[PDB]
Design a protein around this ligand. Structure first.
Ligand SMILES: [K+]
Ligand SMILES: [K+]
Ligand SMILES: [Mg+2]
Ligand SMILES: [Mg+2]
Ligand SMILES: [Mg+2]
Ligand SMILES: [Mg+2]
Ligand SMILES: [Mg+2]
Ligand SMILES: [Mg+2]
Ligand SMILES: [Mg+2]
Ligand SMILES: [Mg+2]
Ligand SMILES: [Mg+2]
Ligand SMILES: [Mg+2]
Ligand SMILES: [Mg+2]
Ligand SMILES: [Mg+2]
Ligand SMILES: [Mg+2]
Ligand SMILES: [Mg+2]
Ligand SMILES: [Mg+2]
Ligand SMILES: [Mg+2]
Ligand SMILES: [Mg+2]
Ligand SMILES: [Mg+2]
Ligand SMILES: [Mg+2]
Ligand SMILES: [Mg+2]
Ligand SMILES: [Mg+2]
Ligand SMILES: [Mg+2]
Ligand SMILES: [Mg+2]
Ligand SMILES: [Mg+2]
Ligand SMILES: [Mg+2]
Ligand SMILES: [Mg+2]
Ligand SMILES: [Mg+2]
Ligand SMILES: [Mg+2]
Lengths: 73, 88, 119, 101
RNA sequence: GUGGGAGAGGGUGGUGGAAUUCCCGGAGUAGCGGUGAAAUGCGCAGAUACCGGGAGGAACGCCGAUGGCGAAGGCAGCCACCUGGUCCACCCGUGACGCUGAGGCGCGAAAGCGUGGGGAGCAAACCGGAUUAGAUACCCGGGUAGUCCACGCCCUAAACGAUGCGCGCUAGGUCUCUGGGUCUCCUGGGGGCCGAAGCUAACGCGUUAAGCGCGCCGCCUGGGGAGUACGGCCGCAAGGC
């Protein structure tokens, strides 16, 4: 479980409240559109809690996927 | 909602002297403010009970403060009611 | 009577059966097969071996249309899902990719009592 | 009055004239509902993560505004009256919350 | 009071994607489904599997936790509006204004009731298939009320922490959520676990007491008969107290 590391560890200083930023947000989703758990995100309680919101917003806007297809099954 | 200039307006209206914030008159005034606003909110939204509990609590607080004021100085009490136009 | 030669292969696998459709690039099917398409009738349709036979039958019928390479897409968890994929790779059809498209609701509809303790 | 952000996603297949038209209509509704535009960002055509109205792309508009909140919902409703307007999302503005600070 | 904070707290209106069902179209043909195994059932009036479109209802995957909010029941897609509670910092204002609370008033899961809508999925009753010594049931196929909305009732529960509310006092340790700070750590408010003293019949509780105390409320006095009978009050009824 979470064998590479820390999505937060590799990234710059970024706004968690920017739902309009696809580049940064796409890193917090798995292969499927699923939002990564805390083990993977490396975030904190309210950090994660905010990220979920902004991601869901971006999904509504059409910038991020709700779900994806898995490859090489 | 209740903004800051509104609240400050009512505070400086019922103050007993410049600087007074928490005297009984001012508190009864603020409670009357919040109660009126909230009851207006409950005129529609009849199905919001969780706020209605708040209304009960605010009314309770106002009535206890007024009970105190009536007990202490009946003149300030009559004055307060005549000013706000409560009870009845 | 097509000459498709490149297409899609849908493996839909439940616990009770495995049905394999093979389609043109636009998704319109060409040939299909299943546990019941081969001899099996009862519970044996949900077998991995029946899944192998189904995949192979479907692929044979597909290469009859002059099919060569397919993109495999899998829906469902059941025995002989993977065995269907394996038969398909071994079929002589070139498998360009495998994908799990298996549908899941995001808490949509009430399941049958068998499937309860879920939503 | 409060500070908002209006996200608008339009038809990428629009030509110049009709696009200028839709933008004009947006401006007019915005003004008519009492909004002042502090900043506007036109991102242009962008790739959606999934089709909206059959189309893989969308035309993005962003308007930071100030306005009489009691009139907000209506504005959004108004913005969605147009056929060529695919998405409208109005958001209460917020101070940026940074990680890696 | 001023200045900040977190939150599925409540109400109204919007809106998003996944899925299910049904309908239209394309392509395709001999089955699908379902079980321990089957049969009913559905399919040559072309099903299942695949693609595109449409209609409609209901619930919101990941995030999601050993988490948060609420007095309780309970509360989870996203957006806005309306609104309740609460915590912290400053130590600014009032000056005992406090606690509890029989009655009263209000809130109160699910099922149920009334009127009108709505009805995709699920499904009491019912109708079928099977299993069985028999099968009423378990298992399988259908399936009405109901489940959803509005308004009005009903007032219950393992309405559970099986632990009434408030305040003061009595070792620590460890994880956690949320504020503040001279930010390795100290300080405040929550949520957990191990444990001092002590308590307990034991199990266990142990600064989130079941410890040491004070105040006020509710309650108990062997089991069955029985939460029955009678009476009263409430309810449209079921029924409740
Ligand atoms: K009890
Ligand atoms: K801090
Ligand atoms: Mg079978
Ligand atoms: Mg191959
Ligand atoms: Mg529109
Ligand atoms: Mg809420
Ligand atoms: Mg749909
Ligand atoms: Mg058809
Ligand atoms: Mg027949
Ligand atoms: Mg025929
Ligand atoms: Mg219908
Ligand atoms: Mg509960
Ligand atoms: Mg608030
Ligand atoms: Mg002082
Ligand atoms: Mg003094
Ligand atoms: Mg009390
Ligand atoms: Mg009363
Ligand atoms: Mg009830
Ligand atoms: Mg009900
Ligand atoms: Mg009814
Ligand atoms: Mg059924
Ligand atoms: Mg049944
Ligand atoms: Mg502790
Ligand atoms: Mg604590
Ligand atoms: Mg603590
Ligand atoms: Mg001891
Ligand atoms: Mg202990
Ligand atoms: Mg006796
Ligand atoms: Mg009884
Ligand atoms: Mg009883």
């Amino acid at each position: 479980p979470s064998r590479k590391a820390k999505v937060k560890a590799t990234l710059g200083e970024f706004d968690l409240r920017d739902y309009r930023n696809v580049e940064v947000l796409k890193r917090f989703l798995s292969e499927t559109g699923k939002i990564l758990p805390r083990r993977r995100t490396g975030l904190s309680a309210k950090e994660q809690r905010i990220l979920a919101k902004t991601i869901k917003r971006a999904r509504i806007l059409g910038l991020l996927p709700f779900t994806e297809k898995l490859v090489r099954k | 909602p209740i903004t800051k200039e509104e609240k400050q307006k009512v505070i400086q209206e019922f103050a007993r002297f410049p600087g007074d914030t928490g005297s009984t008159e001012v508190q009864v005034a603020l409670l009357t403010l919040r109660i009126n606003r909230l009851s207006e909110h409950l005129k529609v939204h009849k199905k919001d009970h969780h706020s209605h509990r708040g209304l009960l609590m605010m009314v309770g607080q106002r009535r206890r403060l007024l009970r105190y004021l009536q007990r202490e100085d009946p003149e300030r009490y009559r004055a307060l009611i005549e000013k706000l136009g409560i009870r009845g | 009577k097509r000459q498709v030669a490149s297409g899609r292969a849908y493996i839909h696998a439940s616990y009770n059966n495995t049905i394999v459709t093979i389609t043109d690039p636009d998704g319109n099917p060409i040939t299909w097969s299943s546990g019941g398409v081969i001899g099996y009738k009862g519970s044996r349709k949900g077998t991995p071996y029946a899944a192998q036979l189904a995949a192979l039958d479907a692929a044979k019928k597909a290469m009859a249309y002059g099919m060569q390479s397919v993109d495999v897409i899998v829906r469902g968890t059941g025995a002989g899902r993977e065995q269907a994929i394996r038969a398909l790779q071994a079929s002589g059809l070139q498998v360009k990719s495998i994908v799990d498209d298996t549908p899941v609701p995001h808490n949509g509809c009430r399941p049958k009592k068998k499937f309860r303790k879920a939503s | 009055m409060r500070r908002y952000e209006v996200n608008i996603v339009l038809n990428p297949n629009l030509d110049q004239s009709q696009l200028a038209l839709e933008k004009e209509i947006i401006q007019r509704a915005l003004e008519n509902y009492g909004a002042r535009v502090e900043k506007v960002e036109e991102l242009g055509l962008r790739r959606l993560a999934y089709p909206i109205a059959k189309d893989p792309q969308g035309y993005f508009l962003w308007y930071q505004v100030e306005m009489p909140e009691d009139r907000v919902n209506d504005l959004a409703r108004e913005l969605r009256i147009r056929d060529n307007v695919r998405r409208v999302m109005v958001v209460k503005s917020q101070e940026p919350f940074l990680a890696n600070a």
